[PDB]
Write a protein that binds this ligand. Structure first.
Ligand SMILES: CC(C)(C)c1cccc(CN[C@H]2C[S@](=O)C[C@@H](Cc3cc(F)c(N)c(OC(C(F)(F)F)C(F)(F)F)c3)[C@@H]2O)c1
Length: 376
């Protein structure tokens, strides 16, 4: 019955992917950001310049106040509000209704995005990182506990954008080839271990601990691939060298300035492919996913009146570990198999196209001492 969830996501480039949900009785409709990088379900519940609608608790007969406050500070944005529970459904999802914790957002600072078309956030990660603390049961935990929905979901994020969130399973029509699984190292974020990095087939040759300093996570709520300082520097250097045929503004590599070319003349060939090797399921075994420049050069609307193709560099520096964001997940089908504590990757049905190259998930590879790549 997964076909009813195919294509249930929409979004705008750089502004996340959202799914339709209803809260309360009678049902109030809201679009909700899909975020594997957090664990709170929260919705606008007071007027805001960027909100066209919001959760009105007074109009819901099934609303219950938990008489406790809550705030969540993300890397950039933050909000605060009041905890409660209500009934929640996903129209293009499983045919169930659950009573879930809901944070009613009453104040926010750079959380809501102008024109994003979503009014709330669905944190799909584990209770360990829920605010105010891990006693606030996350939505998916409530869903599994209260229904017969299997304990897993999958995300097909496609490159004005669309995709699928399959709740409770895997839809085999959404990917090609084999699924490759990497262990979830710890159940807080969706934390994984990267064991090797190559750019155009050349090993970066860093201590693999550097790749996961101080963690590596899969985060649909983040746009970019974000890399620890040392890794970011090595990668930009390598990517500069590969594209040195053309010179770019120093602010381009910082994600500040965008670069444009005549429509249809974008020199994809001069930008390298990036391979991330992930810890596999058996001893000394890994697999790789390969990322094309069509993923890490994010398309942005022309700043001028002209119709050129302009892009932003969607790889940026992190101080909190590697973040495999939307531009990594795009073109892959990603299975969050909570039941078996693993994350699967396969080439998506909406995979990224290049003339002479292709995004791939490939294995098996042999990699010794993968345990040493984890940071402690
Ligand atoms: C929540 C806790 C566990 C405390 C936490 C703290 C720090 C880092 C993390 C890791 N995950 C974070 C990384 S970043 O802050 C985006 C965030 C979700 C989020 C919060 C926001 F405000 C906005 N605007 C948002 O919209 C993005 C954006 F690109 F920014 F427009 C869009 F693309 F989705 F639209 C997305 C993730 O959740 C978790």
């Amino acid at each position: 019955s997964f076909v009813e969830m195919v294509d249930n996501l929409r979004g705008k480039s750089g502004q996340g992917y959202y799914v339709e949900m209803t809260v309360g009785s009678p049902p109030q409709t809201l679009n909700i950001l899909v975020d594997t990088g957090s664990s709170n379900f929260a919705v606008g519940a007071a007027p805001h310049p960027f909100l066209h609608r919001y959760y009105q608790r007074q109009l819901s007969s099934t609303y219950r106040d938990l008489r406790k406050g809550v705030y969540v500070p993300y890397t950039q944005g933050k909000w605060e509000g009041e905890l409660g529970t209500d009934l929640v459904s996903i129209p293009h999802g499983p045919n169930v209704t659950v009573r879930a914790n809901i944070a009613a957002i009453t104040e926010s600072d750079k959380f809501f995005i102008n024109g994003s078309n979503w009014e709330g956030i669905l944190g799909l990660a584990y209770a360990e990182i829920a605010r105010p603390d891990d006693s606030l049961e996350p939505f998916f935990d409530s869903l599994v506990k209260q229904t017969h929905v299997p304990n897993l979901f999958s995300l097909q994020l496609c490159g004005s954008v669309g995709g699928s969130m399959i709740i409770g399973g895997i839809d085999h029509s959404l990917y090609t080839g084999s699924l490759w699984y990497t262990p979830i190292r710890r159940e807080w974020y969706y934390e994984v271990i990267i064991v090797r990095v190559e750019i155009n087939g050349q090993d970066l040759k860093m201590d693999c601990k550097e790749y996961n300093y101080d963690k590596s996570i899969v985060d649909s709520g983040t746009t970019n691939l974000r890399l620890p300082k040392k890794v970011f520097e090595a990668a930009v250097k390598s990517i500069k060298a590969a594209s040195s045929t053309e010179k770019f503004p120093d602010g381009f590599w910082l994600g500040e300035q965008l670069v444009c070319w005549q429509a249809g003349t974008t020199p994809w060939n001069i930008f390298p492919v990036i391979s991330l090797y992930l810890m596999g399921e058996v001893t000394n075994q890994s697999f790789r996913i390969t990322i094309l420049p069509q993923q890490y050069l994010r398309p942005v609307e022309d700043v001028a009146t002209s119709q050129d193709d302009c892009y932003k560099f969607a790889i940026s520096q992190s101080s909190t570990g590697t973040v495999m964001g939307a531009v990594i997940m795009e073109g892959f089908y990603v299975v969050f198999d909570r039941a078996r504590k693993r994350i699967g990757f396969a080439v998506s049905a909406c995979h990224v196209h290049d003339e002479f190259r292709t995004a791939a998930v490939e294995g098996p590879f042999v990699t010794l001492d993968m345990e040493d790549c984890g940071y402690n």
